[PDB]
Amino acid sequence: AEILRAENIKKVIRGYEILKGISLSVKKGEFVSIIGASGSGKSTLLYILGLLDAPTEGKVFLEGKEVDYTNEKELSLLRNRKLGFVFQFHYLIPELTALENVIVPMLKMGKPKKEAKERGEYLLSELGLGDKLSRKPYELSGGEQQRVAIARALANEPILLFADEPTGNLDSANTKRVMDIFLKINEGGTSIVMVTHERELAELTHRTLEMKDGKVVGEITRV
Amino acid sequence: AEILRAENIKKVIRGYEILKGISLSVKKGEFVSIIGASGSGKSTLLYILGLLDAPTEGKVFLEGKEVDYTNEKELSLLRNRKLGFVFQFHYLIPELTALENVIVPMLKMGKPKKEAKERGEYLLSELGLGDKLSRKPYELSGGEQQRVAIARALANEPILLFADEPTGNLDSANTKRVMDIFLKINEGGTSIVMVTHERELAELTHRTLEMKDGKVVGEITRV
Numbered sequence: 001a002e003i004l005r006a007e008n009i010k011k012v013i014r015g016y017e018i019l020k021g022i023s024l025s026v027k028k029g030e031f032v033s034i035i036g037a038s039g040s041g042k043s044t045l046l047y048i049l050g051l052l053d054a055p056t057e058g059k060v061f062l063e064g065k066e067v068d069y070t071n072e073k074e075l076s077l078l079r080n081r082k083l084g085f086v087f088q089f090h091y092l093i094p095e096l097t098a099l100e101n102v103i104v105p106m107l108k109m110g111k112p113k114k115e116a117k118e119r120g121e122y123l124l125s126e127l128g129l130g131d132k133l134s135r136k137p138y139e140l141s142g143g144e145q146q147r148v149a150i151a152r153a154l155a156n157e158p159i160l161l162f163a164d165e166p167t168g169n170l171d172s173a174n175t176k177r178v179m180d181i182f183l184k185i186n187e188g189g190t191s192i193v194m195v196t197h198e199r200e201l202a203e204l205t206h207r208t209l210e211m212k213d214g215k216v217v218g219e220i221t222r223v
Numbered sequence: 224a225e226i227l228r229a230e231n232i233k234k235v236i237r238g239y240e241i242l243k244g245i246s247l248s249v250k251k252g253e254f255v256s257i258i259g260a261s262g263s264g265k266s267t268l269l270y271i272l273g274l275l276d277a278p279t280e281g282k283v284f285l286e287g288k289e290v291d292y293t294n295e296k297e298l299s300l301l302r303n304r305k306l307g308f309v310f311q312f313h314y315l316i317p318e319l320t321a322l323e324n325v326i327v328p329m330l331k332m333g334k335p336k337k338e339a340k341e342r343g344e345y346l347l348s349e350l351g352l353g354d355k356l357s358r359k360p361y362e363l364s365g366g367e368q369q370r371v372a373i374a375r376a377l378a379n380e381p382i383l384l385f386a387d388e389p390t391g392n393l394d395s396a397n398t399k400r401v402m403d404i405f406l407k408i409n410e411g412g413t414s415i416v417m418v419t420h421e422r423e424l425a426e427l428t429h430r431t432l433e434m435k436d437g438k439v440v441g442e443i444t445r446v
């Protein structure tokens with residue numbers, strides 16, 4: 001069962017072709033990693049696969065259905081319902097508690113606050129933050145902040161989780177903790193597409209796509 | 224006096240304030256560094272200051288004149304004629320030789336090819352590439368590729384040069400060489416605004432603006 005498909009993706013910025021024609025497909029349950037050096041365009045690709053930015057050319061299919069870029073508000077809602085994001089930076093709202101930050105995507109779906117908070121507590125508890133539900137971002141360490149972002153990414157049980165160097169700001173201890181969380185999330189059936197410049201992290205995934213100068217130049221499959 | 228000034232600059236992306244209100248000034252001839260880590264928003268700020276992206280709120284003044292971000296034509300004219308850019312990646316055109324790569328912005332400005340090549344040859348020679356004018360990017364090392372990018376940045380004798388972690392992809396030897404080039408360029412009278420996360424690089428500049436969570440939180444004056 002294919003969960004995501006990108007066809008002939010190109011991205012041009014100021015006349016420069018960042019992505020030169022990329023096609024790929026992700027199957028349900030796969031943990032994919034995308035690596036590459038400077039100029040690879042790996043993050044630009046991730047933003048397009050995640051429906052954050054529209055490509056210059058090409059199409060994206062989510063669960064077999066072609067994405068409609070005309071209706072941007074509907075696309076934002078589709079993103080919120082089916083996809084989760086974990087960037088290098090936590091992007092937590094400073095005024096909101098850990099729990100309030102996690103329920104944001106749920107409220108966008110029109111979920112009652114009562115039930116949203118119950119699931120939010122569940123998610124935070126599973127990620128080891130059950131005792132810090134009312135803590136605001138300024139009261140959390142880097143590793144805890146990233147875990148709140150992960151809980152938020154899982155808010156609406158996404159079919160796909162996109163991660164852009166999720167452990168970039170973390171020390172070795174939190175890097176292992178976060179990767180283990182991702183492995184557990186994947187074991188739970190959630191597909192993951194993760195960009196990273198760390199081969200050691202890529203080696204823990206099912207498939208690694210290597211990019212160079214806006215093209216996928218190779219792939220290594222580890223079952 | 225004032226070569227660049229930004230007032231109340233804010234940048235919002237998908238409802239999140241990447242830049243929460245920034246005001247700063249760069250004196251003519253000054254070499255300023257902006258340092259910050261993840262979440263600082265330093266690169267986003269650089270793109271706005273360099274006219275590559277528009278702010279959500281605020282104004283930018285170049286040479287005392289307010290920039291009109293709604294005028295694409297003027298914006299393109301300003302970037303090409305008054306500014307120079309050096310990113311972590313070289314962004315060279317693979318099909319073009321070093322000299323051809325350097326003269327592109329000159330030809331865009333209407334400069335005669337003969338005169339353009341004369342200046343391009345001068346710039347490349349000054350940057351230690353006088354014997355590699357006909358070499359294409361694939362024939363050059365990463366360090367040499369960046370020097371071509373610096374020559375291109377100086378093509379139209381910009382009054383202000385923007386650099387985003389220009390030595391991030393370079394080893395120690397090349398990083399030192401490139402920084403010496405920037406110091407030499409500033410010694411020539413060209414103003415430079417460089418974003419970096421390296422304290423060592425910032426220490427070589429006249430003044431440093433420290434950023435955190437989309438705000439300028441400190442300033443260090445060394446002269």
Ligand SMILES: O=S([O-])[O-]
Pocket residue numbers: 085236237
């Ligand atoms: O910017 S997205 O994660 O809502």
